[PDB]
Amino acid sequence: CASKNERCGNALYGTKGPGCCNGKCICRTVPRKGVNSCRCM
Numbered sequence: 001c002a003s004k005n006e007r008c009g010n011a012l013y014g015t016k017g018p019g020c021c022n023g024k025c026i027c028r029t030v031p032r033k034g035v036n037s038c039r040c041m
Contacts, residue, residue, distance in 0.1 A: 008040050009038065025039070026040070
């Protein structure tokens with residue numbers, strides 16, 4: 001599983017990745033260097 005503030009996955013964002021050990025994933029998207037950045041919050 002993904003660690004604290006680690007890169008995780010999310011089907012809701014068409015992103016295939018591991019799940020957060022304990023918390024909640026935070027997917028972001030913005031031209032400002034934000035190509036579907038999903039960090040574990």
